[PDB]
Copies of this chain bind each other. A is one copy, B any other.
Amino acid sequence: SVQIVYKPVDLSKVTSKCGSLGNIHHKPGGGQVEVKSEKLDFKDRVQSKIGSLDNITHVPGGGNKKIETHKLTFR
């Protein structure tokens, strides 16, 4: 016969104390951006992004993270 028991236990803790979080400034692209193009030939797909794109300001009050995974394997 074959018998398998899988009962792991977690009592661990992820935590943080912050008195105050703030005064955050993100100013992407505050300068002059200039793009001059003449007589350009494109013979396939073109993807273009100009200016201030995809910029992120992420300020979670805690932002703590726990990743837990189990991958029982048998033959």
Within 8 Å CB of A48, what residues of B?
A: 46-50
Interface size on A, residues (CB 8 A): 75
Within 8 Å CB of A55, what residues of B?
A: 26, 28, 52-56
User: Which among B13, B62, B69 is the interface contact of A63 at CB below 8 angstroms?
Assistant: B62
Is there contact, CB below 8 Å, between A7 and B5? yes
Within 8 Å CB of A74, what residues of B?
A: 4, 73-75
Is there contact, CB below 8 Å, between A33 and B34? yes
Within 8 Å CB of A7, what residues of B?
A: 5-9
Is there contact, CB below 8 Å, between A16 and B50? no
Residues of A within 8 A of B (CB): 1-75
